[PDB]
Amino acid sequence: SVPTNLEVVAATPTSLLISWDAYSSSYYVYYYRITYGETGGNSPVQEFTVPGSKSTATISGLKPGVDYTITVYAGHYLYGLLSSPISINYRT
Amino acid sequence: IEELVIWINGDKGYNGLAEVGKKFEKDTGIKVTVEHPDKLEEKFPQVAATGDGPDIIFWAHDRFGGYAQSGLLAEITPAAAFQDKLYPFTWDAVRYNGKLIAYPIAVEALSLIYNKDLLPNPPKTWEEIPALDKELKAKGKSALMFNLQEPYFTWPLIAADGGYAFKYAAGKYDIKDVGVDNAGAKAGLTFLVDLIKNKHMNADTDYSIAEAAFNKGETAMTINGPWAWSNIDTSAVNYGVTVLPTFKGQPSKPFVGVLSAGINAASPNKELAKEFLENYLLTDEGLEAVNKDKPLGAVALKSYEEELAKDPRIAATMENAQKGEIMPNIPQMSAFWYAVRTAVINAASGRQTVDAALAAAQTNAAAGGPVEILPFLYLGSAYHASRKDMLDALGITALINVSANCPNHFEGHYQYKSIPVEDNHKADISSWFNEAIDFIDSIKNAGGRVFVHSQAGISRSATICLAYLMRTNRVKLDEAFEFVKQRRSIISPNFSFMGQLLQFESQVLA
């Protein structure tokens, strides 16, 4: 259903190239939604979507030296946004 | 291996199918065992790629195209008579490249679902809906709420006046012929976008919001399929299921999913399989046994569908199915879902006009061309590898074919290098990096040009290009990645391939 592994594969002081194991999501899945926000912060997370055929995404415009919570949700072609997202904490 | 084992998912009437399988044995002697393995559709291609899998696989037709693209299914040969026992539109759902590959069994499609107490006479036309909502809003209610996020739900309106996903003719889909930005699609999406801008509907309504608003009586209609009936039964809404509204005098065109049974091509009981399905399963007797275990909904057998249609909900499902479009079973359907999803969000919110949004979606969903990475190195899809004149016009003299099933289409005219890997985590694609890098250099030194391709030109072939830029420039993966991505924005090596590329990074920089 949903991916199960999520990593940063490249980094700059203000940006992260992430990767998730999309191959583990069923063929029903037509996009992924990525959210990110300062861990422990007040502000609502920022979010964008990518095509279900992507296993990679760039998160950019981050503050340097800050811990971010990064979440990947699966999107189903009928129901839409699914539950049980995958998340990591990662510091720029 | 062995000599009939039938795979079906557990959500369905497998016990009832076991019965039509004992009633088989008491007629044939030969035994049929019905197992319902978990993650069934994921296990079948794993195990049937070698052999030791079932003889007959049951599943929605849309995944059978991937199966057939891998050869895992046999070309069923149904009597010309037997085909008339099924509705003719169902046979279109079970072909790949023109050949039949499954027997149609059951059929689902969206319908109009309405609250009989709020609205005993649901509108027959989309155009009626704004007046009706103006009336209901003055009572605190709304006319219609349904999922606006997924193109699967909005497409029936967008298609009514002429839109379509991929043109289908003579048993084949033409992935160059996308009907997203024609006049019919513009008119339907303009109507939709107008319902939102006039606050008859909300741009944020998704599956959950819609399903709760209707089952709590806040809205007079929703749009949904038979999977949703159980939750409405639980609620205090007296509901009906009916034909979708027309738009500009023409029916709404929901996508149609055809539950289907395929024959394992790597199995000898191909005759015992044809025997069981053609003459023991798809009979009034056969489907009823399955139906009694767990209902099938609308069914593809005309005789037994007449029976079930006594339920007006099932009759409405079949009627919307017969006016709808078969769900394309080709891999390009995924880019279509995402492209239309962006179009609807951007038009519904005013970020783009209907025309700009559909035009960009047309471009995203329809096939493009190869992409120049380096003057002697191009990147693209399996589609491109079959257009000889187009490659000849680019000066391509050699292809790298990164696939398990794609032919070299013009052997002897181009030099071919095969890299036979699947796009999954198990595939050791980096053990081909050196060999592929030498081929590209070899062709380059002889003055030629290499076209590197995989099915979608997204994961496998991009990985080969990225590795080439890395060894050849002694640069890091994130630099190669940025380079290709700016030329072909969709490239995305799979998770395991990104790891293999990172391992390769520290080798070429040591």
Swiss-Prot record, chain B:
A biological process from GO: DNA damage response
Induction: Induced by maltose and the transcriptional regulator MalT. Permanently repressed by cold shock in a PNPase-dependent fashion.
One term under GO cellular component: periplasmic space
Alphabetized UniProt keyword annotations: Periplasm, Signal, Sugar transport, Transport
Entry-linked Pfam families: SBP_bac_1
CDD domains per UniProt: PBP2_MBP
Entry's localization field: Periplasm
Described function: Part of the ABC transporter complex MalEFGK involved in maltose/maltodextrin import. Binds maltose and higher maltodextrins such as maltotriose.
Family (UniProt): Belongs to the bacterial solute-binding protein 1 family.
Protein name (database record): Maltose/maltodextrin-binding periplasmic protein
